């Protein structure tokens, strides 16, 4: 619509070792035109970058803490971003934010320069029970 | 791989005081690609500064970012009640990494 909105969904209480898919619905902009990210915040701790997908959809990168277990993807026809999380661990408890990056275009390696996060969603809480 | 560290852990100040927040990178930040964010309790982060010194749209003049190489600074010239929050730096010179945050709280 008029204002840019990012709305995350899918969070809840989940048991160790299970899988969960989060979603981020964008409005007011076309998410396929930007690098899109997931950033999480564990309770009482700081922001931790999780994953990026480039505007072309062909490149994805992940934090070492989640690589191999998480997958970032996008549904271009529905303006939606997804995070598929497998083998959930106690350290995955956090509120998960979807964020837009207006700078990043090419990411040929995991060490090249990236971008900053100009719009954020409200977050969705994932709690791994014990 | 680039570790970002912020100081101090907490600033306890009254409204009207100036706040100076420091952020140090373990390696020089390419192109001075350093951003600052504000996060109020229970809210999502808000972009304040990008490219170490450029204000985002709608950010008041009292906020300024500076620095280069490994050492960066966010200054709030006069704290307003809405400025009490947690502030994060984030480098994007090599991948994406955040500092641990500095809490700016009202002095009691």
Residue numbers in the entry:
A (entry chain H): 3 to 132
B (entry chain L): 1 to 108
Copy the relevant paper text:
Fortunately, we obtained one neutralizing MAb against IAVs, named as AF4H1K1, which can effectively neutralize H3-clade viruses in vitro and possess the prophylactic and therapeutic efficacy against both H3 and H7 subtype IAVs in vivo. Further structural analysis demonstrates that the epitope recognized by AF4H1K1 is located in the HA stem region and the light chain K1 can modulate local conformation of paired heavy chain to change the protection profile, compared with the non-binding AF4H1K1 single chain variable fragment (scFv) and AF4H1L1 Fab molecules. AF4H1K1 binds most of group 2 HAs with high affinities, with KD values from 4 pM to 49 nM for H3, H4, H14, H7, and H10 HAs, respectively. The AF4H1K1 Fab fragment binds both H3 HA and H4 HA at the stem and vestigial-esterase domains with a similar orientation, where the Fab molecule is roughly orthogonal to the HA stalk.
To further confirm that the different conformations between HCDR3 from H3-bound or H4-bound AF4H1K1 and HCDR3 from AF4H1L1 are due to the allosteric effect of the paired light chain, but not due to that induced by the HA binding, we solved the crystal structure of free AF4H1K1 scFv at 1.4 Å resolution as well. Of note, HCDR1, HCDR2, HCDR3, and HFR3 of the unbound AF4H1K1 scFv possess the same conformation with the ones from the H3-bound and H4-bound AF4H1K1 Fab molecules. In AF4H1K1 Fab, the HCDR3 loop bends backward to avoid the A-helix of HA2, allowing enough space for the bulky side chains of Phe107 and Trp109 in the hydrophobic pocket at the base of A-helix. In AF4H1K1 Fab, the amino acids Gln90, Gly93, and Ser94 in LCDR3 loop form a continuous hydrogen bond pattern with the main chain of Ser111, Gly112, and Gly113 in HCDR3, which drags the HCDR3 loop to fold back so that to hinder the neighboring Trp109 and Phe107 side chains from flipping upward, whereas in AF4H1L1 Fab the hydrogen bond network between the main chains of HCDR3 and LCDR3 is interrupted to accommodate the bulky side chain of Trp90 in LCDR3. Compared with the free AF4H1K1 scFv molecule, the HCDR3 of AF4H1L1 does flip away from the LCDR3. This demonstrates that the conformational change of AF4H1L1 is driven by the paired light chain but not the result of induced fit due to HA binding. Here, for the first time, our study reveals that light chain could contribute to the binding and neutralizing spectrum by modulating the conformation of paired heavy chain.
